Amino acid sequence: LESQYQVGPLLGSGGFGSVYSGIRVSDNLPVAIKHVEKDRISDWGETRVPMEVVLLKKVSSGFSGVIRLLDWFERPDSFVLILERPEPVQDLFDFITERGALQEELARSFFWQVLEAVRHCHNCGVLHRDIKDENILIDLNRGELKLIDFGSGALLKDTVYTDFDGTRVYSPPEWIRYHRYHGRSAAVWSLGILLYDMVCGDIPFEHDEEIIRGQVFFRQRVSSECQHLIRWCLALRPSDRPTFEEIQNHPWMQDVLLPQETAEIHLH
Ligand SMILES: Fc1ccc(-c2nc3n(c2-c2ccncc2)CCS3)cc1
Ligand SMILES: [Ca+2]
């Protein structure tokens, strides 16, 4: 590990562990090196590994809008994950904080890419469970978005989930009320929160009561088409929420820019 990778500065730390910038020695490939202590691991899978490793392996085959796991290591008291690192890069949270509410053309491109990435995970049998601005990286040169942090994820199933350790303000009312949710419909809710965040520059709900009330107020000028899509994704009844197909077939989602085109217009 220490022979294969050259460690750089700390990028961040938190519930996910500690992430360092790094370089692969063999070919100077930019990487991210994530350390997590074993006793801080709550979810295990299978060799006994963090569920995160299991999930990442399932989604890291081939190209995608997901940050890929290149390798991993077990230490006596920790696991070390080697992940892709775009450069230059900025997470969506920082980007929005910096630039404010996004133009709908830009939000369309970003949201479309997030949808394709989430579809990839689900098709690979993986549920992310923590879709939000902080867990989305922007390749600033290519205009490509990449999903990160499967640490709260789970294998995708059609039965009910009774556990959740993702972000509460992105969590659906059925979780708040009943501690029960289904994967896809819960994902769609979080995507509704995300889309609002893109076009308004902030999330629509802070309190549990606002979430379960489900009333959406717009603080920025947002097109009626976009408002409709957001409110559809944020339907109180899970079964009233759109499928991924319905979201991507929505009138607001038409004529999306290519990632490179998005970068040239909005990022370069
Ligand atoms: F180029 C990169 C920048 C951030 C990451 C990254 N990948 C993960 N986390 C972070 C991250 C790093 C720093 N601050 C916040 C999140 C958390 C769990 S998985 C990877 C590559
Ligand atoms: Ca947010």
From Swiss-Prot:
Enzyme class: transferase
Domain Protein kinase, residue spans: 5-253
Domain of life of the source: Eukaryota
Assigned keywords, A-Z: Apoptosis, ATP-binding, Cell cycle, Cell membrane, Cytoplasm, Host-virus interaction, Kinase, Magnesium, Membrane, Metal-binding, Nucleotide-binding, Nucleus, Phosphoprotein, Proto-oncogene, Serine/threonine-protein kinase, Transferase, Ubl conjugation
Secreted among keywords: no
Reaction catalysis annotation: L-seryl-[protein] + ATP = O-phospho-L-seryl-[protein] + ADP + H(+); L-threonyl-[protein] + ATP = O-phospho-L-threonyl-[protein] + ADP + H(+)
Gene3D superfamilies per record: Phosphorylase Kinase, domain 1, Transferase(Phosphotransferase) domain 1
Residues of the active site: 130
Induction notes from the record: By interferon-gamma (IFNG). Strongly induced in leukocytes by the JAK/STAT pathway in response to cytokines. Induced by different cellular stresses, heat shock and cytotoxic agents.
Disulfide bond entries: none
Binding site for ATP: 11-19, 34, 84, 91
GO MF, one annotated term: transcription factor binding
Effect of residue 35 to Y: Increased kinase activity
Required cofactor names: Mg(2+)
Keyword DNA repair: no
UniProt tissue specificity: Expressed primarily in cells of the hematopoietic and germline lineages. Isoform 1 and isoform 2 are both expressed in prostate cancer cell lines.
A Pfam match: Pkinase
Cellular component aspect of the GO annotation: cytoplasm; cytosol; nucleolus; nucleoplasm; nucleus; plasma membrane
SUPFAM superfamilies xref list: Protein kinase-like (PK-like)
UniProt EC number: 2.7.11.1
PANTHER family: SERINE/THREONINE-PROTEIN KINASE PIM, SERINE_THREONINE-PROTEIN KINASE PIM-1
Function in brief: Proto-oncogene with serine/threonine kinase activity involved in cell survival and cell proliferation and thus providing a selective advantage in tumorigenesis. Exerts its oncogenic activity through: the regulation of MYC transcriptional activity, the regulation of cell cycle progression and by phosphorylation and inhibition of proapoptotic proteins (BAD, MAP3K5, FOXO3). Phosphorylation of MYC leads to an increase of MYC protein stability and thereby an increase of transcriptional activity.
The protein's name: Serine/threonine-protein kinase pim-1
Organism per entry: Homo sapiens (Human)
Gene (name only): PIM1
